[PDB]
Amino acid sequence: SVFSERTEESSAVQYFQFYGYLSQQQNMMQDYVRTGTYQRAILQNHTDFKDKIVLDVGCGSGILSFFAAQAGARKIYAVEASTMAQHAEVLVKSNNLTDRIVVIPGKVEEVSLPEQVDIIISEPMGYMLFNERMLESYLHAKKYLKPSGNMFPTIGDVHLAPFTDEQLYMEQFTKANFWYQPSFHGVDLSALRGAAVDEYFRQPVVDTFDIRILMAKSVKYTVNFLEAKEGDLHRIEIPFKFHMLHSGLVHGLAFWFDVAFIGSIMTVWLSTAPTEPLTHWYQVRCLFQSPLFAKAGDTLSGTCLLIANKRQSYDISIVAQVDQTGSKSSNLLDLKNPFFRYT
Amino acid sequence: SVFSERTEESSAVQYFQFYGYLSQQQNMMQDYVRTGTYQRAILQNHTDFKDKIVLDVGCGSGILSFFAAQAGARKIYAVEASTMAQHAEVLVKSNNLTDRIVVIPGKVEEVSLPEQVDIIISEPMGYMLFNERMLESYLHAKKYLKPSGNMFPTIGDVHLAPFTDEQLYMEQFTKANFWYQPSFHGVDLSALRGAAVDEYFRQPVVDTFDIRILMAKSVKYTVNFLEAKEGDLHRIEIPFKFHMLHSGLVHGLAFWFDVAFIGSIMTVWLSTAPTEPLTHWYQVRCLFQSPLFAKAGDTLSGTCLLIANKRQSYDISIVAQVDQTGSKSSNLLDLKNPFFRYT
Amino acid sequence: SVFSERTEESSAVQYFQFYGYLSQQQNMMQDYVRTGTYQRAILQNHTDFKDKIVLDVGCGSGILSFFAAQAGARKIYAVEASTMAQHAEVLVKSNNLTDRIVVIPGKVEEVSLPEQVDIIISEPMGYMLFNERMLESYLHAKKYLKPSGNMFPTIGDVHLAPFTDEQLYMEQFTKANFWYQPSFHGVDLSALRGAAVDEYFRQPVVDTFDIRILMAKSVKYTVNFLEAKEGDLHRIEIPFKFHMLHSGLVHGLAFWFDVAFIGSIMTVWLSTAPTEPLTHWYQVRCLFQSPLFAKAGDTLSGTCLLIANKRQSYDISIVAQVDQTGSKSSNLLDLKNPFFRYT
Amino acid sequence: SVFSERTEESSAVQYFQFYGYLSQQQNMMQDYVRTGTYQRAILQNHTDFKDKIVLDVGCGSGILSFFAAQAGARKIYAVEASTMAQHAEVLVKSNNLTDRIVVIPGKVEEVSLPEQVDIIISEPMGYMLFNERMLESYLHAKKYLKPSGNMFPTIGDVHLAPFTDEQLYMEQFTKANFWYQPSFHGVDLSALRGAAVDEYFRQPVVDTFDIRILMAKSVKYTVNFLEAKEGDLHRIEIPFKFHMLHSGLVHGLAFWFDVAFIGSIMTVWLSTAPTEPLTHWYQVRCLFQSPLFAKAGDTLSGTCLLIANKRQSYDISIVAQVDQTGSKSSNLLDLKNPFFRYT
Numbered sequence A, B, C, D: 001s002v003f004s005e006r007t008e009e010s011s012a013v014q015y016f017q018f019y020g021y022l023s024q025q026q027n028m029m030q031d032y033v034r035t036g037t038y039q040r041a042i043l044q045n046h047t048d049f050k051d052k053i054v055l056d057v058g059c060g061s062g063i064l065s066f067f068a069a070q071a072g073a074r075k076i077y078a079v080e081a082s083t084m085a086q087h088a089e090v091l092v093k094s095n096n097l098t099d100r101i102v103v104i105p106g107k108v109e110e111v112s113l114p115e116q117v118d119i120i121i122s123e124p125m126g127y128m129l130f131n132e133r134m135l136e137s138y139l140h141a142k143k144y145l146k147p148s149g150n151m152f153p154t155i156g157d158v159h160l161a162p163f164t165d166e167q168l169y170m171e172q173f174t175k176a177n178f179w180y181q182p183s184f185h186g187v188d189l190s191a192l193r194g195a196a197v198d199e200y201f202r203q204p205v206v207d208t209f210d211i212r213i214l215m216a217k218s219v220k221y222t223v224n225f226l227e228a229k230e231g232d233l234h235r236i237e238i239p240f241k242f243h244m245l246h247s248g249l250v251h252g253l254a255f256w257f258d259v260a261f262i263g264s265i266m267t268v269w270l271s272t273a274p275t276e277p278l279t280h281w282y283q284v285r286c287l288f289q290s291p292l293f294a295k296a297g298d299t300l301s302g303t304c305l306l307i308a309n310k311r312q313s314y315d316i317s318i319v320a321q322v323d324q325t326g327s328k329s330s331n332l333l334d335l336k337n338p339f340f341r342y343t
């Protein structure tokens, strides 16, 4: 399958075991911004659902499919690859919806649907939008979408902006310098200090922060889910030119994302921006190995290149330079292994 | 290999990926009770190492092999299956011990060792002693042990005792009660209530506690590593009879473990008991879905059965009854998916 | 004067300002082991005091002189160089003792006494016994002592023993590694890391510890105050040969001291040993820059050389080797600048 | 020199010995409010530094001079009288800034600078702003400032307000009551009771506190560093009139300070107020030996007089009265000998 071809089995097993726990489903369901905004996007756009055929890609507990049914959908195909499919089936029956919701256990790349659909609904967003590579499954599902069918969400916006955070930056050395000692119980650990520093800096930092650490207006990269192909997400190149609003040291790039449900009645947005209430996605920061000094009015230019890997994630390459000084920084990060810093 | 035959590939990949990170090594190394106790066991029994051949099973960073080198070992084979093996080699070179510590990358079940050894050293203990199934690798390594050889640690004691903790019980129950709701955003979840309670109560709780929650003297189950065979650990049956010292609700069983390094000069103990300073093993508690009432003087009897699985862990069944009343509790726990409660 | 010649003025000013505070006098007076043992040594040896002429070297508040008066002394000359002399004079008057106690403001090296004395009393001990160099003032005062006069205290014993304390040792690097960072607010501090390590290791550590960290029986260096000359304290060479009782890493030498009041009726001891209740002297530890591995039964030999300086303290040189292995360590410490670690 | 004429040698030696230690630099540098605020003031006013000549008065480790170099300064003269000057030189070389930062060892009152400067930067603030008398050195340095030059910081605000804190009062009184005893080991100490109370209450208390102990809005005394002369700080008279907002016992006056960096781009404030995050300056409280009762609505008036002394500090007299009743308190404090209470 398209799925098995881009995913190492070991990663897939762990991934679907994770989503097999009711507690994980519960954690997502209790993210009120998330769950409530999906319900609102669907119910306030009831004409996109009333007596329509729906596909729910990765339905989990089945919650979005129930929202589609609340909006009057004629038929919803709820596809789910983890053992959560069995629990979803239990809920469709106990909610007296077997006539309208059909749970199909399996990967959307591998199951067959009996007919084409009017609209696809899904919640495929990971950290930095793209983590987990579930957006490719969502795009893949368009083989079942009628011409001029719709997608909920319709678009995804990733935002990037430079930040200053001296304490976050210094924390990496404080941790790595554990290895910078000549007699840990008689052992000189110091030769591994560099490798420890490298390891810490390869981890994107998942947590939130005060918006005043941001040093320029964000740059936006947009995926239009109606138009994009799966293959478009294998290599994501995000150029940037930041016009610095504040003078100081740039320690890295901060990431967040928005999605929009562009319905016939209205467009509804779900935002994970640091200006909005917190979600279980938090925000993500990628540190530079060497911070960059910039003045207000300087421009910081470069590229964030996301390369998909078979562990359902991305290798992140960020290169940046201050155009007025030629001062340059790089970093390579592993989005599969983020550091969860939030407290 | 014996390892691959008992281990799903998905579990193994994740397992060795986890131990390849220097941050994880740092966390273990900074458990001073652990590291310091190992060092004392080895250095205070230096005659068991002096001019001897040593096998370090799962050497990680190499720390135990450095302790063996400090005690005068002639040659140490340091076997390690994760990429940490490469960091160990770096430390062996920077500590000028290339003539004495030989890193052999690979699984101890799969590598070839050049000669038989006088003594095996390892830290194969996981949560509840048996999590990770590394004890089987430790025993498997005895194929390289000379007939009169020694094992450090030499024996392992598992302790179990009944506890009362209404707050922990209610804490888990509260999490499960989410699935009781008849109208979560209009959706009836209640048909999954039973499955949710099962799942939450299937999680052993890893943290520490006040010894005053313990309601009876512990029962001890001993594994002698010099004598035991790998196959002995596929099915571990721990019968118990507690003489209740206090009246109240028994909410479950608490578990901890001790190991002994039985050297020629002295026996050194490493204990994870709640009466001892905390270690990174904490303690483990298995909750009953329904607590048992017992009076002081009653006997609480039954069995804790651990059945090894291919995710390098155990399926635990605990059956316990209050002999005087016939009140019985049966519970199933998945040692692989614990709730890390300590903060 | 002999005093001004061995003491920089800047050090002397600070020193006597310190002892000019009633709060400092109070801190010493409330050390019950100290104050109570002096009172007992004097009162239980009343025949060394009854109708005798006494000199109190550095009388502070006058407390020891009052003890000499309680024991029946005919005349006590209480010499004190700080402004505390004025407060002592206030107490002699308010305690109706002007007929028996004469306060003489000034340095004992500079004042004149009207007659010779039978006994000198003083509390001249600093950290590691010798800090503050007040023992030289005490010895100097013997110009006023009759032949076969006595000294209270009569002898001083400094004890040295090797210790292991991995956490104390590792703490120095944890602190110094603050400087091992390449971008502290944009500044690379790393070039000063070595100097910071050196500075921390030059400080003797003042605090107490568990006696189980000691790795061999102490070696004793004795000053007989009846026999010693001032000049004997300018260069103090303490050879040692420790016979290791435990195997492990030696991180340094621990110091404490005893004094004895050898009276006609009995000898009374004041001990600051780690086996005795704590005093305001605590104990003192000097770290080795490189720890030394020793086995039980090995011998650790070397010298502790104390060289007096004009800041009323000593430059400490410690050189040690494990005779069985030839492994060697040094350190140079500044006793004037100790690190007060006690909590 | 102007420095030696106002400073006892004993005080100066100790003063510069203290600042020669890297551990003390580390403590200051790790005050993140301080370091970060200085860096912001300088970098956000980079046009006040770009291609300019800078004098850093008492540069210590050199950190402010590095901030000036970051902002584009053409040449920075970094003057430092302690041996820290040698560590600064090391950092200037290892940070490749030898062409821009020039360390000049010595007292700013005594060295020769090669040219006049555009801007002076320093951190001359001590406890209560004026402790250490370093502000006079800062002002003295204006002999090198070009006519249109700037000072960073530009102004300093001292705040004082009445407080109530029975527990602190009793804490000090309790320490003094030792000297009340009529029979400490048989000795009557009481004649020194008054002297002891004076001494303890002469100590300003350095720590922080809840703003709810403050009984009136603060009164502000401003020093403009662009305008002030050295001689202005020999005698500092701060009159005050508080409009009491709460009824109760006034136990003393609390002090803190703000400084402003008045740059061409923006003014940046560094505040040590108890309403702001804690700094290593904490706050300072001067206790009355006898608290004053006041009702809400009353006025508390008087003067805080600071007279500079040759131990690089001030003798403080605070006279305060409750205007409605004539209740008056006069107190004397020695700013050089504070009680560091924070833990």
Ligand SMILES: N=C(N)NCCCN(CC[C@H](N)C(=O)O)C[C@H]1O[C@@H](n2cnc3c(N)ncnc32)[C@H](O)[C@@H]1O
Pocket: A003, A016, A019, A020, A028, A029, A057, A058, A059, A060, A061, A062, A063, A064, A079, A080, A081, A082, A084, A106, A107, A108, A109, A122, A123, A124, A125, A126, A127, A132, A134, A137
């Ligand atoms: N919030 C995040 N970070 N990520 C996303 C939210 C998780 N989750 C949401 C559940 C539910 N819709 C809800 O909104 O509540 C996505 C589910 O999609 C399934 N899946 C992933 N690839 C699949 C595939 N190729 N074929 C079938 N199923 C798949 C996973 O097993 C998982 O149950």
Ligand SMILES: N=C(N)NCCCN(CC[C@H](N)C(=O)O)C[C@H]1O[C@@H](n2cnc3c(N)ncnc32)[C@H](O)[C@@H]1O
Pocket: B003, B016, B019, B025, B028, B057, B058, B059, B060, B061, B062, B063, B064, B079, B080, B081, B082, B084, B106, B107, B108, B109, B122, B123, B124, B125, B126, B127, B132, B134, B137
């Ligand atoms: N503390 C816990 N909870 N459990 C205890 C685990 C601690 N850890 C020991 C670390 C070492 N003594 C140190 O101090 O660093 C286990 C190491 O053994 C290796 N290993 C596991 N089976 C292996 C195998 N079959 N063949 C080779 N290597 C193996 C793992 O990769 C890991 O590196």
Ligand SMILES: N=C(N)NCCCN(CC[C@H](N)C(=O)O)C[C@H]1O[C@@H](n2cnc3c(N)ncnc32)[C@H](O)[C@@H]1O
Pocket: C003, C016, C019, C020, C028, C029, C057, C058, C059, C060, C061, C062, C063, C064, C079, C080, C081, C082, C084, C106, C107, C108, C109, C122, C123, C124, C125, C126, C127, C132, C134, C137
């Ligand atoms: N405990 C410690 N660490 N050290 C020692 C205890 C401090 N203190 C004890 C006070 C009192 N006898 C008591 O037992 O309470 C010693 C006093 O000796 C004076 N002095 C020091 N050289 C002096 C000199 N050359 N000439 C005159 N006076 C001198 C100092 O000013 C100080 O007041």
Ligand SMILES: N=C(N)NCCCN(CC[C@H](N)C(=O)O)C[C@H]1O[C@@H](n2cnc3c(N)ncnc32)[C@H](O)[C@@H]1O
Pocket: D003, D016, D019, D025, D028, D057, D058, D059, D060, D061, D062, D063, D064, D079, D080, D081, D082, D084, D106, D107, D108, D109, D122, D123, D124, D125, D126, D127, D132, D134, D137
């Ligand atoms: N924080 C407090 N409580 N007070 C604030 C002090 C902080 N400290 C500033 C440190 C520096 N900016 C840094 O960030 O490191 C004072 C330094 O100024 C020097 N000095 C003092 N008078 C000097 C003089 N007359 N001539 C030359 N040098 C002098 C001292 O030796 C000391 O190095």
